[PDB]
Amino acid sequence: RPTFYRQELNKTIWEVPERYQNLSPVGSGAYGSVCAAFDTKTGLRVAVKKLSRPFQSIIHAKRTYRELRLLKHMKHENVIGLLDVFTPARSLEEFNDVYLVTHLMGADLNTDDHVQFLIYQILRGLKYIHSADIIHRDLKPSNLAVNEDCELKILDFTRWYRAPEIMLNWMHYNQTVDIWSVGCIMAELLTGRTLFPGTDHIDQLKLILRLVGTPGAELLKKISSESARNYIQSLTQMPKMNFANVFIGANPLAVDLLEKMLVLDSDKRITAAQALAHAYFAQYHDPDDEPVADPYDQSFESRDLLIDEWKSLTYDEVISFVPPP
Numbered sequence: 001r002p003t004f005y006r007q008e009l010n011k012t013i014w015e016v017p018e019r020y021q022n023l024s025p026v027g028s029g030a031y032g033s034v035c036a037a038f039d040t041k042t043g044l045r046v047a048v049k050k051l052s053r054p055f056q057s058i059i060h061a062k063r064t065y066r067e068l069r070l071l072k073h074m075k076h077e078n079v080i081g082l083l084d085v086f087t088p089a090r091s092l093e094e095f096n097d098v099y100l101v102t103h104l105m106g107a108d109l110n111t112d113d114h115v116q117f118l119i120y121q122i123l124r125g126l127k128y129i130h131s132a133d134i135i136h137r138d139l140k141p142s143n144l145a146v147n148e149d150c151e152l153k154i155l156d157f158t159r160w161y162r163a164p165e166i167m168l169n170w171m172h173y174n175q176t177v178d179i180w181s182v183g184c185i186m187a188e189l190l191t192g193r194t195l196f197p198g199t200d201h202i203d204q205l206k207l208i209l210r211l212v213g214t215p216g217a218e219l220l221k222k223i224s225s226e227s228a229r230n231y232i233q234s235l236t237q238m239p240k241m242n243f244a245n246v247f248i249g250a251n252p253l254a255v256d257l258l259e260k261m262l263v264l265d266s267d268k269r270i271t272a273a274q275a276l277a278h279a280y281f282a283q284y285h286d287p288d289d290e291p292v293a294d295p296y297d298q299s300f301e302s303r304d305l306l307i308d309e310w311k312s313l314t315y316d317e318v319i320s321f322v323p324p325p
């Protein structure tokens with residue numbers, strides 16, 4: 001048990017071990033608040049997350065446990081991972097706050113070579129997480145860490161990048177909702193503008209159908225919601241657009257990979273595994289270093305336990321954490 005020192009950053013207090021210095025507020029909000037700091041034990045700059053009120057409700061305590069256990073299983077280059085994780089209390093009774101650490105990467109994702117490297121790393125990071133049965137569901141430029149080397153990591157701190165089959169609100173889509181999010185990002189990189197800046201769910205939907213055109217008899221026969229079907233079918237029939245003319249001036253392999261990422265039928269959208277195998281990442285693909293992730297247990301997701309129960313479980317995770325080599 002190292003020396004823990006206290007300090008009031010923003011409207012918040014911070015009680016972290018001596019080894020972390022130059023605590024510089026970087027961001028706060030709906031999650032906890034992050035501070036950039038320097039790790040004298042390893043010489044590296046880090047990002048430290050102080051989870052808000054870890055266990056103020058059952059949703060807070062469950063969510064807490066869910067972040068810790070994920071990041072504790074996440075070990076990939078193109079995916080945020082756990083350097084350290086600590087707290088100032090000894091014994092479960094005193095356990096009140098949790099802090100997380102990671103490689104300070106600087107800047108958020110917010111040149112055909114640059115969109116080539118950049119996007120390749122997202123799909124590489126996605127295939128991995130997805131291979132563990134995890135779906136980001138919140139993929140957007142602000143959730144993509146990138147250093148000056150253009151090296152990019154995925155994390156999770158709009159509707160604009162959300163998949164169609166979840167604007168209407170589906171109860172069980174697939175992992176490719178993430179692939180749609182990528183296609184939206186790749187389009188922003190190449191053009192500079194937000195593909196679908198819908199002002200509302202319904203608006204956003206109009207926007208999306210304008211480019212991709214409205215559903216076919218095959219897709220339509222795949223929606224249970226009369227409401228959802230009634231909303232879509234109730235929109236003026238629209239011809240899908242000529243992506244070529246939409247993204248004129250871009251490498252036609254990038255245009256072609258897009259056509260495969262922005263398909264309304266999640267059942268016919270390209271997966272990450274498959275995306276990496278596109279000709280657009282020929283200069284970067286290598287099937288021998290696009291790893292998958294060990295098996296991830298999220299059966300806990302299904303249960304409803306007491307806050308103290310969720311709390312103990314997390315206490316446990318903390319103390320059983322082993323730092324990377």
Ligand SMILES: Cc1ccc(-n2nc(C(C)(C)C)cc2NC(=O)Nc2ccc(OCCN3CCOCC3)c3ccccc23)cc1
Pocket residue numbers: 026034047048049063064066067068070071074079080100101102103104105106107129134136145154155156157
């Ligand atoms: C409940 C919950 C469960 C899971 C998540 N979740 N899911 C993912 C995956 C899917 C991408 C693996 C990632 C996360 N969690 C995070 O992305 N958490 C974080 C966000 C931003 C951070 O630092 C921001 C500062 N930024 C980082 C890089 O350096 C520059 C600044 C963090 C710093 C230290 C520890 C966690 C951080 C989130 C919440």
